[PDB]
Design an enzyme around this catalytic site. Structure first.
Site, mmCIF file in Angstrom:
data_model
loop_
_atom_site.group_PDB
_atom_site.id
_atom_site.type_symbol
_atom_site.label_atom_id
_atom_site.label_comp_id
_atom_site.label_asym_id
_atom_site.label_seq_id
_atom_site.Cartn_x
_atom_site.Cartn_y
_atom_site.Cartn_z
ATOM 1 N N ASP A 198 0.795 -1.230 0.000
ATOM 2 C CA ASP A 198 0.000 0.000 0.000
ATOM 3 C C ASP A 198 0.830 1.284 0.000
ATOM 4 O O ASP A 198 0.272 2.362 0.042
ATOM 5 C CB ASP A 198 -1.005 0.022 1.153
ATOM 6 C CG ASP A 198 -0.344 -0.054 2.538
ATOM 7 O OD1 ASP A 198 0.705 -0.716 2.681
ATOM 8 O OD2 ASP A 198 -0.928 0.503 3.501
ATOM 9 N N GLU A 213 31.497 15.805 -16.137
ATOM 10 C CA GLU A 213 30.274 16.250 -16.794
ATOM 11 C C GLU A 213 29.819 17.603 -16.260
ATOM 12 O O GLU A 213 29.668 17.789 -15.048
ATOM 13 C CB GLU A 213 29.189 15.192 -16.632
ATOM 14 C CG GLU A 213 27.764 15.657 -16.966
ATOM 15 C CD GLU A 213 26.766 14.529 -16.884
ATOM 16 O OE1 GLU A 213 26.918 13.669 -15.995
ATOM 17 O OE2 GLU A 213 25.826 14.483 -17.713
HETATM 18 MG MG LIG Z 1 25.369 12.340 -15.396
HETATM 19 MG MG LIG Z 2 24.372 13.167 -18.379
#
Ligand SMILES: [Mg+2]
Ligand SMILES: [Mg+2]
Ligand SMILES: [Cl-]
Ligand SMILES: [Cl-]
Ligand SMILES: [Cl-]
Ligand SMILES: [Cl-]
Ligand SMILES: [Cl-]
Ligand SMILES: [Cl-]
Ligand SMILES: [Cl-]
Ligand SMILES: [Cl-]
Ligand SMILES: [Mg+2]
Ligand SMILES: [Mg+2]
Ligand SMILES: [Mg+2]
Ligand SMILES: [Mg+2]
Ligand SMILES: [Mg+2]
Ligand SMILES: [Mg+2]
Lengths: 440, 440, 440, 440
Positions: free
Chosen positions: B38, B406
């Site tokens: 649930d 990144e």
């Molecule tokens: Mg990433």
């Molecule tokens: Mg990425």
């Protein structure tokens, strides 16, 4: 504290011992779940699949075959080793390593389930299957049975009987092993440390979500990465919303904050609620309501033991509540008449206790009105509360107060053990803790 | 920084402006999603529904009706006010407050959608619907159209044309407004602070999940409650697994750790990766691989601008990588021949850049081989990496090294703005940061 | 001859007698079936539903409840009386008249099935259901069980066991009552009169479909409105197609025609095949093949009795066939070696016998290779055939000859009774019949 | 009279001419339909698939591709040649023979549809598909579009627009070619001969189903194997049930019998109703009602022409009916007031006319209240009726009389041609026909 390979195997055998000869039990893994577009939520294994495996991959099925009263064996379907998939998304157990790792007799590729499952069920009398849980699992089972029904020219036969294993398995889950209790004890301790940290960090002007952040960080640092349910941080009027999870408001000097949060540790749930003043000091009105909820909890903790029931203890709590609300002028009239009309229900509108385990609202039969007689090994919460709506027709000073106090206990031969008493709940001990933290 | 009611309205109008006269566009909310039994995962609204509403409830449908070239109006279906549901699960906007809150013309109960939707589509020529996204939405649309097709005796007519609005809407999402860029800028800053904190906290002997805990706590404290994707903390060989999320290992003195983590702030994703030594000091071998990945990123950041493409910049990165791997003896042969055989692919096996927005892998047409020409307002990642498998046939000292770096950028008229440069990536600046934190 | 209300009731009780105490059996009517657009095929009730009811309406469900070992009762769900529906589409039994008409205890509106079925199953241990037969029935059963599983707060409980009643019911159907045999006897007589009529009407230049027309008219005039399967009239090479139903060719002087046709009379199937010359005279080549098929049938009719099997009689037929084909040069070699390589199979590629009843291919377990030992009350076909493809590598004169001769029999204490011997099959008796009709 | 290969091709081209450039139209064959267990109803092709192909096999899909404004081509998916399947169930066209037989450019195996369809739709702008007609077809189309949407890395693109071809195709079907009219003319003649035969055969004591038998035999002998809808033979009170199909009663001396029956000839429907005395002589009361229904029909046949409408002619019939019922005392009051309250509706409760073609209730837009202006080439029925319930509050002698008279007409430049006037309807001509047959 964890659950070992040997214990998962013991559970599998205990199931097999309950199964008819000439039968197979099928237990399916949870599907992966989309969060948005191509991104998925972090994977949560099906609790029953987990109970029998400790295996945290999707696309897996446990098949337990009881050929007759002496002979039985286990087959796992699971994802194949795949270099590219694993470079991207992570390591897979695969088929070669599964029998030793998990303690099953045989492992096969999930991709082959439709080619293999009907062959495993052929000529059996009974199939145990939790129908309606997952659509994908139902398609697999129904296809296998259909192949068998329609395969008489190939000398195939389908079992004519399908039995839901959930009643039996859920009754198993209801009674914890000592090892499960140790894991739950650790979950209770981790959750308690988190709630203590929230009380020590809380200051007026912080947002509700800030205490959620403190709590989740504390869970994580002890190795409980995820909560067992979405954290509730309800300050002021938000405390009157039972499962308030927006946690979006600035916490005000003079309001209470109700935190309901629990970790998930090795699969098992903690579930603690503490309510406390944002500014470290209860007002008179807050203290007056708090004392009733605390008496309810302390009385319940004295009472819970083998041979009583949640219903019976609930009756004692209802009397405590009605009496206290009469004394404060929130209810008016004769206590016994008020009890007989369930006059507490506008202010206490939920159950006192639920089972606790691999789900926070754990499986197991409660009996009518939660009348089932308690026995050692059962694990449950104790969570009285009082919620006075901002527009309730009651003395003004109580409006908008929402208070719950929740502990997790295990029934023992001699009463109960409180797994979460390491976070304070007496109002003077809450104030002392907060005063100390507020001085730095 | 957030997106306001007026901007959601502007988006709705821009869609309507693209719609044929005699048409309606239907946009459906995400279903709620079970975590276990649930309990549900915390709710994540459908990104396209969110784009047009800022409304975070399930059981809701936005209907935009363009009666003709001058006349149009909006109808929201949403959950009704319900005292009991709200005491339990939280406040609902309801119908009375929705038009003013959201800026729609009309609101109706979701429970009435099957009684009302066909009446809204009756006599229209075109229905815009994202077919195949949600099964529940498809059932609703197909039922409405079936009622109309079959209702000629009641003078009902179905639109004969259904158009997928996703190409048009996703092209809208691909180009950010200045307000969206400000939100993404804030997401980048919050995510960067989290990664800085991870570098400052990391010590040998901590578990990968501990840095996840630090990161999520930092997200939360700035008001980004949830990550935009499951956090990756890959130390040692785990760094060679692109989306490693188990985060279960003890981080070793002498290994690198690769953290890929991003917050979700007002719906929008950050996406940062930093790789750094667990013990605060790169080995020679680690530094040699790191320098190639860093040159790839720095070169890409110099190059990205209107008029180039991800494909074109990718070619420059591939040359940098092949050249560097030749110099280290990881690849052998002539650089240009190696490039022509995509010899980098065992070590760099993913794309350099993806669009970024309400999804971390954001919507929008890339063109063949991501050749689409870049224009201002596009937001994308830049994430070169090199992953040297523990069993790669390369000089031994490089085996098991996984490095990615990144950043998130926005294309501007004059080049790009780096939204995530506030967390360091030069190896000397990483070492300095970690040395300072390690001294306390 | 028909099946009465009392016999349907006896069947219901015999099922109940086999059911566990604390159980319910659910038997669902066939859905109506679209022929084209708004037009439907003439309604055919589900054979098992029919077996227990004699009730020819859709939207009906028989529920047999066995409360315990002494107490049981029946509930029918069926369409309500409805003035407008009945003025259009015909009379409905309705609820008031159903108990007396059908002999059930209680009748309820089909429209109320979802509100009522779960209440009937509540607290039972076992539900008997033929899962996978009809999707609409499965939805109803699964919804009811889901309501019960999820209804513990309302003190509801689902049966944990589901048993397919088809094995038990189909075993019942396999053994005919004397009343069923009388109905099948009448079906055999009606079908035989039809085939006699086809032989007497057939002339070169008529189309295959013309004999279908004669056959269906004869069925109808005796009160069998519909065939039990699509009529086959295969002249010339079409006779080599086992279930050829196009019946579209002009019947040629010099060809045989194979007619396989059977009526459906009070629910029960006839199934007769006769093959005969279109021009009333077998050629030598046709007669040579015909004699082998006739010997096979006559031998099978002598042999079939309690204590043998379809497998055992099939072996005798295979020897007759191989021997005859060797004698004609169609097969070459030693008979016993040929038998051992199943060399007859290019020319006789189907089973000799199937069960016959409410379905033409009737329900019931055959045993491996149809080895089940025959007992009185079983009803089956006997249908040897030989089909020589137009391009078979055999003496040219046999190519394109397709011959089958099929009778319907009932196993008795002393052998079998042939229900269809009133249509001729000896070649001289066929020629005599056709010569007489051809003279007018 | 039939529809040729060239006409199917002309239809395909006319569709293509209406299609957008860069588009494909998908037309799916009807699924086969179970009658009981393993037996199927005789196959009826989807009318729209048939309209474009004349191809009577299942598992087939017509794909019409319009590459641009000059270039287009056709692909058929259909069942492969298969020796074993064909020996059993009949010949298949297969892929090699299909292009020449059907006049399509290309044929592919149906088994390959999922591997091929997405490739045909790739890069198109529009797909024409009749969504919601068949579930199996929807699965195929949705899978193809999903592959394309999700296949951008393989340079695939889905059409964003789906258009229901049914409005355009059904408008085509509404206007018959001269060849279609010839086929319908033949259907009308065959159906008329059948009804004449029923009148000549009918005698008191025969069952309703006996006249059904006569009718179906007559259909068959002219090469119309199947009726276009389930035959209605309603004698006595059964005549008041509009689509009475039980046909189970013994026809009584003194009752009328209403026969509504039509053949299906080369795909096209006849639809004739005649009502006549079982004993060959109308009673006064029967004649009084009959005369009103006949006047209604004769007046409608005089009126129907280009430029009027079913609505307009219906008004004239309603006046005739009200006037006649007033004259008989069935209705009481002022004709015009009675008309204004639709007082005829208890006795005439259906439409006067429907379109007629490949479906008996043929496709085509009627306009509001069937107000569409008639044009040459439209084919429709004319079927006034009066049904006086056995318990109607009307003079006793009229109770239980059900009368309908139905002809099939084609609108011409100068009025209409009656396709079914070769079976008598004047009461004196009915009595004469029956008297002659009753003398033998
Ligand atoms: Mg990433
Ligand atoms: Mg990425
Ligand atoms: Cl797999
Ligand atoms: Cl509760
Ligand atoms: Cl609602
Ligand atoms: Cl990629
Ligand atoms: Cl009903
Ligand atoms: Cl067979
Ligand atoms: Cl095929
Ligand atoms: Cl009508
Ligand atoms: Mg709680
Ligand atoms: Mg709780
Ligand atoms: Mg047969
Ligand atoms: Mg047979
Ligand atoms: Mg008719
Ligand atoms: Mg009609």
């Amino acid at each position: 504290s964890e659950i070992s390979r040997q214990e998962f195997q013991r559970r599998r055998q205990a199931l097999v011992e309950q199964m008819q000869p000439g039968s197979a039990a099928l237990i399916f893994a949870a599907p992966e779940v989309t969060r948005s577009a191509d991104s998925e939520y972090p994977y949560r294994q099906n609790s029953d699949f987990w109970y029998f495996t400790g295996f945290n991959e999707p696309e897996a099925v446990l098949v337990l075959i009881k050929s007759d009263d002496t002979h039985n064996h286990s087959v796992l379907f699971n994802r194949v080793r795949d270099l590219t998939a694993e470079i991207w998304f992570g390591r897979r157990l695969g088929q070669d390593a599964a029998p030793e790792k998990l303690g099953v007799d045989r492992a096969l590729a999930f991709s082959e389930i439709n080619q293999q499952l009907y062959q495993l069920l052929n000529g059996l009398d009974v199939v145990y299957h939790a129908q309606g849980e997952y659509a994908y699992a139902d398609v697999i089972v129904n296809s296998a049975l259909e192949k068998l029904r329609k395969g008489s020219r190939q000398n195939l036969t389908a079992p004519a009987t399908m039995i839901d294993w959930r009643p039996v398995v859920h009754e198993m889950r209801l009674f914890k092993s000592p090892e499960e209790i140790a894991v739950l004890r650790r979950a209770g301790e981790i959750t308690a440390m988190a709630h203590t940290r929230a009380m020590e960090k809380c200051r007026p002007g912080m947002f509700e979500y800030h205490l959620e952040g403190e709590i989740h960080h504390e869970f994580n640092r002890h190795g409980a990465r995820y909560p067992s349910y979405n954290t509730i941080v309800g300050s002021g009027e938000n405390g009157c919303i039972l499962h308030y999870t927006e946690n979006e408001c600035e916490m005000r000097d003079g309001d209470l904050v109700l935190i309901d949060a629990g970790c998930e540790y090795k699969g098992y749930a903690g579930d603690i609620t503490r309510t406390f003043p944002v500014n470290g000091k209860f007002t008179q009105a807050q203290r007056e309501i708090y004392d009733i909820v605390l008496e309810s909890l302390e009385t319940s903790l004295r009472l819970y033991r083998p041979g009583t029931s949640i219903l019976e203890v609930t009756g004692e709590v209802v009397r405590i509540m009605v009496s206290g609300l009469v004394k404060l002028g929130i209810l008016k009239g004769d206590v016994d008449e008020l009890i007989a009309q369930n006059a507490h229900r506008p202010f206490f509108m939920h159950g006192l206790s639920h089972w606790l385990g691999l789900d926070v609202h754990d499986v197991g039969v409660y009996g009518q009105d939660r009348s089932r007689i308690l026995e050692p090994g059962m694990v449950l919460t104790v969570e009285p509360g009082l919620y006075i709506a901002p527009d309730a027709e009651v003395p003004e000073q109580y409006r908008g107060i929402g208070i719950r106090i929740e502990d997790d206990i295990v029934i023992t031969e001699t009463g109960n053990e409180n797994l979460t008493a390491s976070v304070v709940k007496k109002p003077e001990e809450i104030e002392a803790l907060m005063v100390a933290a507020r001085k730095q």
